[PDB]
Amino acid sequence: AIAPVITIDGPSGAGKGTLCKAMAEALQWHLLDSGAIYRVLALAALHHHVDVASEDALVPLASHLDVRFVSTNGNLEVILEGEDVSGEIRTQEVANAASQVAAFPRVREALLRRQRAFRELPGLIADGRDMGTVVFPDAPVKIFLDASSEERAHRRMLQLQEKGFSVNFERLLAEIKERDDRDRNRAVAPLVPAADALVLDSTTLSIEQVIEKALQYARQKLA
Ligand SMILES: Nc1ccn([C@@H]2O[C@H](COP(=O)(O)O)[C@@H](O)[C@H]2O)c(=O)n1
C-alpha cells in the first residue's frame, strides 16, 4: 500500500496534540495537526477582512491558504504567509472562529488536498476531528481519544492557570461543550468515531498510559 496513517480524532482538549506528538517522535513519523489549519484559516480571515459568516467569502481564502509547518525541535511551529503564528492561533476566540468556518462544506472541501498532501513515508500521525472518517478513511490505524467534558474543561483550566491567565470553570466548560456540540452536530464531516477506531477513554488515564496504550495498538496493527 501507500504510506501508512495513524489517525487521532476526538473532542476539544482531549490531549490529541500531545499524543500525536509523542507517537510521531516514538515512531519517527511525520505529523499533521489539522485543527491548526482551520485556526490559521480563521486568523487569515480576520487579517484579510474576510466575512467569517460567509461561505462564499471563505472559499477563496481556503483554496489559496498559505500555511506551512516546522518542528523537530521540541514544538510545532505554524507559519501563515511567512509569519510564525503559533501563539496567535491558540486562543478561545480563534478556536471558536475555526469551528464556525469548519462547518461550511465548500470550505472543508477546499482544504482536503492540502491535508492529504501530508501523507508521506515512513508514515503520518494525523490529529483532528474527521481524520479517520473523511480525510484518511483507509487509515490502517484509527484512534478516537475521548474524556468527559468536565475533565477536559478542568485540564484546560489548569493549563491556563499555570500561565497566569484569568479563567473560571463555568465559562471554560460552556465554551468546550458549545464547540464540541457544533462539531458533532454539523451535517458534513461531523466529529464521530470511525467504525474501526479504537476508543481511548482517558478521563482517568495518565498521559504516559495513553501514549503506551496508543503505541501498543498501532504497533500490533502496523508491525
Ligand atoms: N480535522 C479537523 C480539525 C479541526 N476541525 C475544526 O477546527 C476546530 C479547532 O480544532 P483544534 O481545537 O483541534 O485546533 C474544531 O473545533 C473543529 O471545528 C475540524 O473540523 N476537523
Curated annotation (Swiss-Prot):
Its main location: cytoplasm. It is found in: Cytoplasm. The keyword Lipid biosynthesis does not apply. It catalyses: CMP + ATP = CDP + ADP; dCMP + ATP = dCDP + ADP. It is an enzyme of class 2 (transferase). Gene3D superfamilies: P-loop containing nucleotide triphosphate hydrolases (3.40.50.300). The keyword Cytoplasm applies. Belongs to the cytidylate kinase family. Type 1 subfamily. This is Cytidylate kinase. It comes from Escherichia coli (strain K12). The lineage of its organism: Bacteria, Pseudomonadati, Pseudomonadota, Gammaproteobacteria, Enterobacterales.
